Amino acid sequence: TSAAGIISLLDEDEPQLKEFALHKLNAVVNDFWAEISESVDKIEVLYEDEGFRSRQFAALVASKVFYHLGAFEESLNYALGAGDLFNVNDNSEYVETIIAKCIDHYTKQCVENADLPEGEKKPIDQRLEGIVNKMFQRCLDDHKYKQAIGIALETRRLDVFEKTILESNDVPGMLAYSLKLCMSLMQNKQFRNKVLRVLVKIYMNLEKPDFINVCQCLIFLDDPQAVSDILEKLVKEDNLLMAYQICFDLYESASQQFLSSVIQNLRTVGQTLKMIKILSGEMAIELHLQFLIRNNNTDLMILKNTKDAVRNSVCHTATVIANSFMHCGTTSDQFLRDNLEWLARATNWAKFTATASLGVIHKGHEKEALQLMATYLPKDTSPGSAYQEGGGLYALGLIHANHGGDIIDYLLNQLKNASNDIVRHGGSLGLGLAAMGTARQDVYDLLKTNLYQDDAVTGEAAGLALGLVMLGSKNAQAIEDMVGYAQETQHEKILRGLAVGIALVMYGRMEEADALIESLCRDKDPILRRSGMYTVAMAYCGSGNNKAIRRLLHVAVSDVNDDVRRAAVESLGFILFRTPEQCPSVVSLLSESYNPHVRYGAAMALGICCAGTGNKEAINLLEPMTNDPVNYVRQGALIASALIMIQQTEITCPKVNQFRQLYSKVINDKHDDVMAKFGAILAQGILDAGGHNVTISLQSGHTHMPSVVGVLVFTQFWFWFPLSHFLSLAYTPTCVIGLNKDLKMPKVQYKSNCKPSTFAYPAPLDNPARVMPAQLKVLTMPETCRYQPFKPLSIGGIIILKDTELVEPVAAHGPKIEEEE
């Protein structure tokens, strides 16, 4: 009824009574704690009487009062005090509450504990830890373990996340779920990296685990030993396809920097040169070209219609590129022959650019390209203009990026021999191009002079390639140098591209560059601030760092200079890469703003985030921007759309028609600029790059920096025009081709129905062509033919039907490679 007696019994002696007070009280606390809430002071003291045993009664009683008072760390403490009065299986909402309440406490504690150290210890009140684990036990007895995991995820207890569930059940679906999750989640990668190792280990237990899992996991760890352990274990398990597919997991994932370790390792580790031959990936280049050469869907007529459309100096430049796109790796001079007077209408830089646009066209010809450049190469004389001559230099590496180091260094010798002007720029361009991601001090160094040689022409490229060389965590000294040279060296561009290099060699460093970031942020000059975002990108690109974004926002918010903001907005979609999701909602603010640059920078990042993705929703936001009075804006918007829109077209996306026609419209329009038509023709050519049969991909799964580069390269173009050919990087095959062991290329159309978008594409069956990352995965193989994959089906670019009876029927098939390669 009312607690007054129990209130009175409280102070009354005979701990017997006090017990039976507390006892009777305890039961009727639930209501009457309210009256009792004033007795708590004694009750406190009561809990301080070791004389009176049961006081844990009062403690939990107080805990009852405290929930009923909304006091918890109080209640918890005294519930913790209880241990007896308290139990987990005791079911009240309160108990459930206080537990759940008690629980949360653990997490940050554990996390704060996790902060300094991480693992076992007595720092945390074991009672909680117990009850924690006891619920984790209950979680184990719940036996849905993400339940336990997500806790232990935050609980950071691998002990819990040991392997109990592992041996239990759920062979394929107890790690990846969390693992793929962990990638998305855990702040400290170390905790996640801890998972990754064990995960591999859990998988290394191997009732034949999925390796691409481990691959990505390894690629996430970039731990060669694991792969080598795999490789041994592989060699232990050795099967061509297994090795192959592993090497196909490998050739498509491991960084140019990482993988090369494994190469020399795999070399030293012995074997199977096929692996070393898969390390080429030239097969892809071949297959890609093979795919291209085969599956190229061209219609230069419309591009001719675009080329014959208008004639000028700036515009004539653009169409020198879109032609490259449609020929990218496709190796054709079609229009190049059409207008030879084209070259007349080209200008020293366009002449320079027209010469470079060749490497695009031949990209993936790892022999011819040099011979392709040969007539325009160096020493081999020239018809006129050392830029055209300069053009090959940069044009060369386009094909040979990472693979032309020799010629590069060779050309770098030509550079070293004389760094200055085009002869040093175009070379100064293509050097870091192939040298990108490879750490060569000379590349840094040789440029560093060519840099310091202070040719706005030349020194610029140095500000890039040097970044490209040390692209990675690089070295802070060059940073100092660059940053020094930034403030030191007197030029707009030469000073400018530095921060870009700074942006480069700060890559994934994240927290690291924050200094220089802050420095760049604190810069008077836009340039440092400018690259800061890009720096922040390459640091935090992919995974969103809110604070970064938050900073990037507020920076873009807080900067006078618009380009910076524009940039700052642009670079967002990098640290915002992994979620294109809100990016429209994100830019939906910046979509609508007084300023064009803001509205300009909008286009890219979103156009970037969904480049390899969907969201006509995202798209349609930009179409108003495609009408923003500044052609430069829409030009960007034009581009931004097409960056997304490749392969997505034709009533899959009906809008492409306009968008295409819009270009043509513009391309027809005389009153639209060579801003306007520029992007238009390009964005057209974008959609039509790689015979329109190729895609744009980046961290769609693990990042590839080369995908990024062309973007950030293309970033400043109306700034510095002869760049965008960098964009050739993210060009990605939709190829679907049998491949196999002997590589007899058996081509089958595996025939599993997608709503058919190999029918949805530009005008002018499962084998190669359109496909789609999706239209890939609505299609599955037949078991009927000779060859079967272990991974059963897969994406488009990776192909490789695994080979399961030689010099017999199943005939023969060949391609560009089989000829020369």
Partner 1 sequence: AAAAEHSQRELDTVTLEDIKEHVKQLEKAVSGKEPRFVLRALRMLTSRRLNHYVLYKALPEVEAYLQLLVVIFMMNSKRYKEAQKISDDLMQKISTQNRRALDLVAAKCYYYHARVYEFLDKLDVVRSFLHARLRTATLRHDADGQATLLNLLLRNYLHYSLYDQAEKLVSKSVFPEQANNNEWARYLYYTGRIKAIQLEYSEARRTMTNALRKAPQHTAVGFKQTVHKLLIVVELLLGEIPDRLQFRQPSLKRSLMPYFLLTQAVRTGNLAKFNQVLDQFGEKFQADGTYTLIIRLRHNVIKTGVRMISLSYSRISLADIAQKLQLDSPEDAEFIVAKAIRDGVIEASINHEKGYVQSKEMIDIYSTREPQLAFHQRISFCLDIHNMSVKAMRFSYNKDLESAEERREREQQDLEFAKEM
Partner 2 sequence: YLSKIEELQLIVNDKSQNLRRLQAQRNELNAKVRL
Partner 3 sequence: DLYSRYKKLQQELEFLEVQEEYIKDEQKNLKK
100 touching partner 2, by CB under 8 A: yes
Rule CB under 8 A: choose which of 301, 374, 589, 651 binds partner 3: 589
Q: What does 624 bind: partner 1, partner 3, partner 2, none (CB cut-off 5 to 8 Å by kind)?
A: partner 1
User: Which of partner 1, partner 3, partner 2, none does 135 bind, CB closer than 5 to 8 A by kind?
Assistant: partner 2
Question: How many H helices and E strands in the chain?
Answer: 43, 2
Q: Does 169 bind partner 1 (CB under 8 A)?
A: no
- Residue 99 found at the interface with partner 2 (CB under 8 A): yes
Quick check: 632 binds partner 1 (CB under 8 A)?
no
HSE value, Cβ hemisphere, 13 Å, CA-based, for 321:
28
Provide the terminal-to-terminal Cα distance of the chain, rounded to the nearest Å.
94
**Which window, 373-381, 475-483, 588-596, 725-733, contacts partner 2 (CB under 8 A)?**
588-596
* Residue 589 engages partner 2 in binding (rule: CB under 8 A): yes
Out of 51, 173, 629, 764, name the contact with partner 1 by CB under 8 A.
629
Site size toward partner 3, by CB under 8 A: 25
What is the Cα gyration radius of the chain?
32
Residue 554 binds which of partner 2, partner 1, partner 3, none (CB < 5-8 A, kind-dependent): partner 3
Q: Which residues contact 283 (CB under 8 A, 6 or more apart)?
A: 277, 739, 743, 817
Q: Which is nearer to partner 1, 368 or 623 (CB)?
A: 623
Task: Tell me which residues in 418-437 interact with partner 3 (CB under 8 A).
Answer: none
For 314, 636, 637, 685, 718, the CA distances from 630, given in Å and listed in that order, are 17, 10, 11, 22, 14
- If one asks whether residue 553 binds partner 3 (CB under 8 A), the answer comes out as yes
Helix 386-400 with 405-417: angle, nearest 10 deg: 150
Residues 20-59 that bind partner 1 (CB under 8 A): 30-31, 34-35, 37-38
Residue with tokens 């366009």: 350
Please tell me whether residue 147 binds partner 2 under the rule CB under 8 A.
Answer: yes
Secondary structure class of 575 (helix, strand, coil): helix
- Report what 671 binds from partner 3, partner 1, partner 2, none; CB cut-off 5-8 Å by kind: partner 1
Q: How far apart are alpha carbons 256 and 258 in whole angstroms?
A: 6
DSSP one-letter string for 365-414: -TTHHHHHHHTTSSSS--SS-HHHHHHHHHHHHHHHTTT-HHHHHHHHHH
Binding mask 176-215 for partner 3 (x = CB under 8 A): -xx--x--xx------------------------------
Give min distance, CB of 67 to partner 1, in A.
7
Q: Is 657 in the site for partner 3 (CB under 8 A)?
A: no
Q: Does 166 sit near partner 2 (CB under 8 A)? A: no
Q: Does 103 bind partner 1 (CB under 8 A)?
A: no
In this structure, how many other beta carbons lie within 10 angstroms of the beta carbon of residue 493? 17
Sign of dihedral through CA atoms 31, 33, 34, 35?
positive
Using the minimum distance from each CB to partner 3, give the nearer residue, 149 or 637.
Answer: 149
In sequence order, what E strands does 40-88 have? none
Dist. CA 501–CA 18, nearest whole Å: 76
Nearer to partner 3, 117 or 624 (CB): 624
Q: Which is nearer to partner 3, 144 or 267 (CB)?
A: 144
Among 11, 162, 488, 592, contact with partner 1 (rule: CB under 8 A): 592
Q: Does 115 bind partner 1 (CB under 8 A)?
A: no
| Contacts with 410 (C-beta within 8 Å, 6 or more apart), sequence order | none
Of 19-27, 77-85, 281-289, 589-597, the segment contacting partner 2 by CB under 8 A is 589-597
For residue 149, the partner it binds in partner 1, partner 3, partner 2, none, with Cβ less than 5 to 8 A by kind, is: partner 3
Q: Would you count residue 592 as binding partner 2 (CB under 8 A)? A: yes
User: Does 93 engage in binding with partner 1 (CB under 8 A)?
Assistant: yes
Cβ distance 583 to 576 under 8 Å? yes
239 touches which of partner 2, partner 1, partner 3, none (CB within 5 to 8 A by kind)? none
Task: Choose among 101, 57, 115, 65: nearest CA to 82.
Answer: 57
- CA–CA separation, 607 and 618 (whole Å): 8
* Residue 52 to residues 6, 12, 45, 88, 204, Cα–Cα distance (Å): 17, 13, 11, 24, 56
| Residue 96 binds to partner 2 (criterion: CB under 8 A) | yes
What percent helix, strand, coil does the chain show, rounded to 5? 60, 0, 35
Site for partner 1 in 639-698 (CB under 8 A): 671
Q: Which residue has the tokens 């504690």?
A: 109
Q: How far is the CB of 100 from partner 1 (least distance, A)?
A: 9
Residues at the interface with partner 2 (CB under 8 A): 96, 99-100, 103, 135, 147, 150-151, 589, 592-594
Residues at the interface with partner 1 (CB under 8 A): 1-2, 30-31, 34-35, 37-38, 67-70, 93-94, 97, 592, 624, 627, 629, 671
